[PDB]
């Protein structure tokens, strides 16, 4: 079942786990959206 | 049958914490931290396959 409310630790570590490349997801009119690049 | 039970249980677990689902559902290339995350969630809770 559900853990003992340690989920935040998991995710916070997932974030603390952060050569980097992103990918363009949208483009048009001179404006782009870039997925990735967690440290820009 | 226990595969089905545990998989629907972890589905409940996913729909219970939306933020962790958002995090593990990033469409990124080096997804390896994600996989760590998930086993970190149920390392000793469910079956191996």
Automatic annotation (TrEMBL), chain B:
Which domain of life does the protein's organism represent? Bacteria
Localization: Cell membrane
Transmembrane regions listed in the UniProt entry: none
Task: Describe its function.
Answer: This protein is part of the stalk that links CF(0) to CF(1). It either transmits conformational changes from CF(0) to CF(1) or is implicated in proton conduction.
Family according to the record: In the N-terminal section; belongs to the ATPase B chain family. In the C-terminal section; belongs to the ATPase delta chain family.
Q: What is the annotated quaternary arrangement, including any partners?
A: F-type ATPases have 2 components, F(1) - the catalytic core - and F(0) - the membrane proton channel. F(1) has five subunits: alpha(3), beta(3), gamma(1), delta(1), epsilon(1). F(0) has three main subunits: a(1), b(2) and c(10-14). The alpha and beta chains form an alternating ring which encloses part of the gamma chain. F(1) is attached to F(0) by a central stalk formed by the gamma and epsilon chains, while a peripheral stalk is formed by the delta and b chains.
The protein depicted here goes by the name: Multifunctional fusion protein
What is the source species? Mycobacterium tuberculosis
| Top-level taxonomy | Bacteria, Bacillati, Actinomycetota, Actinomycetes, Mycobacteriales
- Which gene does this sequence derive from? atpH
**Shown chain mapped onto the complete sequence:** 200 to 248 of 446
């Amino acid at each position: 079942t559900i853990p003992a409310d340690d989920i935040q630790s998991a995710i916070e570590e997932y974030v603390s786990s952060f050569e980097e490349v992103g990918t363009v997801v949208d483009a048009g009119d001179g404006i782009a959206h870039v997925e990735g690049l967690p440290s820009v | 049958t226990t595969l089905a039970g545990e998989l629907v249980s972890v589905a409940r677990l996913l729909d219970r914490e939306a933020v962790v689902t958002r995090y593990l559902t990033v469409p990124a290339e080096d997804a390896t931290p994600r996989i760590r995350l998930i086993e970190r969630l149920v390392s000793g809770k469910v079956g191996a396959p």
